[PDB]
Amino acid sequence: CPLMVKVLDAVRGSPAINVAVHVFRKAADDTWEPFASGKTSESGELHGLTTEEEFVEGIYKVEIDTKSYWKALGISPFHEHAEVVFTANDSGPRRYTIAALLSPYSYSTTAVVTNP
Amino acid sequence: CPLMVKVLDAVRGSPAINVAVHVFRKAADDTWEPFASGKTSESGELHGLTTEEEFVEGIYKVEIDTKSYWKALGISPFHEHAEVVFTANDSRRYTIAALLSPYSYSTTAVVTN
Amino acid sequence: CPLMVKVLDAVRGSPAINVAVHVFRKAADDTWEPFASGKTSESGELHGLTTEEEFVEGIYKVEIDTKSYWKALGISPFHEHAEVVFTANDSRRYTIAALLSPYSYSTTAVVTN
Amino acid sequence: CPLMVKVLDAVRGSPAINVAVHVFRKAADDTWEPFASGKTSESGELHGLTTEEEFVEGIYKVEIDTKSYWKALGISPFHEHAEVVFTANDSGPRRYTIAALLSPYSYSTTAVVTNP
Ligand SMILES: Oc1ccc(/C=C/c2cc(O)cc(O)c2)cc1
Ligand SMILES: Oc1ccc(/C=C/c2cc(O)cc(O)c2)cc1
Ligand code: NA
Ligand code: NA
């Protein structure tokens, strides 16, 4: 799988477990088409969203449902979600790790892009 | 003005100047309606986007054109843009700050008196 | 004043108020000599730490007392403090910003005219 | 090993490879005693710094040599190093991951603390 999402909690110093993630891909008509979804594991990781074959060139949006995560812990957070929008595989196939570090009123995201 | 946007560059240690910023408000049909826009100043700040009267409760999106910023410096960036999506709640000043790198960004909200 | 420190709270979305900040300068014997200190204001800022005359080239450390800040909110934090260590170079205004969470912090430098 | 250090590069979107790391522990006389050191691998990770037996209660400092890392890539960075100072194992043994995300004029650090 060439796409992995990793989420960390900066309040608890832990993986962010059971975080919903929705991935969208921009269609030829400029709409966001559902691409894949899942939720983070006990390690804060979400593996197996897609395959090398399915993960073609395109503009992708990874939506991390931060608000639902914080509400479940009794915190009323600032953001609706964290959205990561990027062009993928435009110089051929790459592996992407999208990491997010969450606080109630802030988040940080980074990408690690590797060439198999 | 109850909304200010501040953009910083983590590579050069400077304000991010002349960055396009677009603000949208979510409509009843779940589409994003253009609300306000501008370019960051020499201080990396964008003031005067809206008024207390116009800035009613609702879901807003701040889109920062990070890709054009990095391309203008000759740096190949990861993201198409940085998006900050939040609910304005009357329960009164919002500063949306973003700290930019080519493959990463950090955003915070400073919500005060 | 060529040095300003700004501290923000990522949990509450607010300035970090009444945070102790200590600045040190590295001496010839590699020890840290006290240089300036204060507490962040209601805006999370600490101004007037030094002067252009005093703030000569050298290695400085800004120590932010994050542990006392979180303990005062009833939150158990990870770090003893946040330390920012940098060289001042005359080749002229330095803002050291820190964004605090209980188990994390982000720091940036904004170095301008 | 109950201590792992992970370093990421926010300019290149990659692990930060060959980053020197020095760990110190506060002695009874309030000095920083050398505890362990090493450098990040091709994955940006540094494993095997210590053992459960050796990693006793104490105040530890993890110094990440960011300046040497950036200078090696032709960037003149702002910070001398990134220092992470924390009390460890004061409620019994824990596993600590210290992560740092680096830019020339900025860094972010977080801890992931797990109970074996
Ligand atoms: O990770 C980070 C994300 C955001 C920030 C904000 C810093 C900052 C600095 C200023 O001088 C004014 C301001 O309104 C904000 C810092 C770090
Ligand atoms: O501001 C930030 C600070 C730290 C991080 C960490 C990301 C990360 C990604 C991994 O694959 C493993 C890991 O241990 C950590 C992300 C953002
Ligand atoms: Na191509
Ligand atoms: Na104890």
Numbering used by the authors:
A (entry chain B), D (entry chain B): 10 to 125
B (entry chain A), C (entry chain A): 10 to 100, 103 to 124
Kindly provide excerpts from the paper associated with this entry.
Transthyretin (TTR) is a plasma and cerebrospinal fluid (CSF) protein synthesized by the liver, choroid plexus, eye and pancreas. TTR is the main transporter of T4 hormone in CSF and the primary carrier of retinol (Vitamin A) binding protein in blood plasma. The inner β-sheets of the dimer–dimer (AB–A′B′) interface form two T4BP cavities referred to as sites AA′ and BB′, respectively.
Conflicting binding modes of resveratrol have been reported. Crystal structures of the TTR:resveratrol complex report contrasting binding modes. Resveratrol has been reported to bind to the T4 binding pocket (T4BP) with rather high affinity. Here we present the crystal structures of wild-type TTR in complex with three trans-stilbene compounds TTR:SB-11, TTR:SB-14, and TTR:resveratrol. Binding of resveratrol (in both orientations) and SB-14 with their hydroxyl groups pointing into HBP3 positions these within distance for H-bonding with Ser117 at the base of the T4BP. A common conformation for Ser117 is imposed when its hydroxyl group H-bonds with a polar ligand as observed for resveratrol (in either pose) and the asymmetric SB-14. Consequently, we selected pH 5.0 as the pH for this assay where the Tm for TTR is 92.3 °C. Resveratrol and SB-14 provided a rather modest +1.1 °C and +1.3 °C thermal shift, respectively.
